[PDB]
Amino acid sequence: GNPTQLVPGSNMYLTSDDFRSPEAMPQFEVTPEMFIPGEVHNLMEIAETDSTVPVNNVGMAVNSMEAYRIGVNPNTGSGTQVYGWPLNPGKSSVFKRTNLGEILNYFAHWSGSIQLTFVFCGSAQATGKFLLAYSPPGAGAPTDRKGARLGTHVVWDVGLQSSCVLEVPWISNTFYRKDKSSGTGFSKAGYVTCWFQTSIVAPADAMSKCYIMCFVSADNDFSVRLLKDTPFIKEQAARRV
């Protein structure tokens, strides 16, 4: 029927509307598309790529290449902790600037599992054992090597393997906004910690200090919802770049 009624919401501008728009250049023939390598369809493809974790974000190490490397001295430290961090890939200072972390800061809620890779960058002659301990959410970090061994853990022998991979489930956002004040400790998130099972020993010509590197990416299908503004841009809306 040609006679109609206009309903509430007529003639308003809703910034999220999806209506057909009039075309300003209808006679213009656009350049045809050509194949370009590396087409992206979804932002989760970026988050599934490993990036280096700045585990050593202590002091001035963030202003150099030292943030990305964890120092291990030979002949010392059996039974002590090498490093550890909470499993909050969006809000923790350890993870918030990686490829996975920056994508997650654009969304209010997310969940999935993360893949953690540890690489020993010492000489081929340096041998030793590490305990990689996983604490489930609500448990808290282990206190000694015995407690770490009594939970979920992998014994990493760097004399046999340069790399060790952990797939950590039950990863989800903990807050509606960015709460880094609990950045060191999250009561809803677990931990990964590394322990000296043995020290690192070597021959006389491989006594140099060694390093471990950590990589992170989304392990499987990761879910994100509720796109928002990233908190890494502020005061620049006023400055107009």
Partner: protein, 232 residues
């Protein structure tokens, strides 16, 4: 969650980048001694809005259409109160495609060029809207260009001439005896049918210039007290 709640439709290109944003606000007047105050102009670019620029710059090459919506409000200046009569104001939004003539005043002929598409809009209606297709002579827009615009001493590093998308101009459509009015226009920007190639790391440092990538050196992340996790 539930048995298959795995959802990623919100991180698709269209939902990550296809959100209407306010990219520019400016004003123009019906009457002024200074001619440049009687019209407004804006070169279409996304590089001056930080939030959109960061999102757009996770990719090297892009293709999209642009939908433009104009929110135009007016107010009366402080002057003689005899002009209590308010004939309804009409507006002209002019798109100048790459290579089109550009106006120098409100009286320039370019306001009448048949090759500059224009909208004529009177106050009290739904906001005017117009769409621009993909405008480049090349096959994609480039967010990054590691080259020089031409081979000369006047070449500009990082400037790709093929990213030209046009300009928008705004003026009142006056009768013989207009009143003194000021109009503010807010331009709303939406990308449509987006394709993107070659992903890049997100911008870490603050943006310094709208035309290049210059930055001050910034630490890779924020600091914590200890490298170990301690039981609190």
């Amino acid at each position: 969650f539930v048995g298959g709640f795995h959802t990623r439709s919100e991180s698709s290109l269209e939902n990550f980048l296809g959100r209407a944003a306010n990219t520019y606000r400016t004003s123009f007047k019906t009457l002024s001694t200074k001619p440049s105050l009687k019209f407004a102009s804006w070169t279409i670019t996304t590089r001056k809005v930080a939030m959109l620029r960061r999102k757009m710059e996770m990719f090297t090459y892009m293709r999209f259409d642009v939908e433009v919506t104009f929110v135009i409000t007016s107010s009366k200046c402080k002057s003689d109160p005899s002009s209590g009569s308010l004939p309804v104001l009409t507006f002209m939004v002019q798109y100048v495609p790459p290579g089109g003539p550009v106006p120098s005043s409100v009286d320039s002929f370019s306001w009448q060029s048949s090759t500059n598409p224009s909208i004529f809009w009177t106050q009290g209606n739904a906001p005017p809207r117009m769409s621009i297709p993909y405008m480049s002579i090349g096959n994609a827009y480039s967010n990054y260009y590691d080259g020089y615009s031409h081979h000369g001493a006047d070449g500009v590093y990082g400037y790709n001439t093929l990213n030209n998308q046009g300009q928008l101009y705004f003026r009142h459509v006056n009768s013989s005896n207009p009143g003194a009015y000021t109009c503010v226009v807010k331009i709303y920007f939406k990308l449509q049918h987006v394709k993107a190639w070659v992903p890049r790391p997100p911008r870490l440092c603050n943006y310094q210039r709208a035309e290049n990538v210059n930055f001050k050196v910034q630490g890779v992340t924020d600091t914590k007290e200890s490298i170990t996790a301690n039981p609190g």
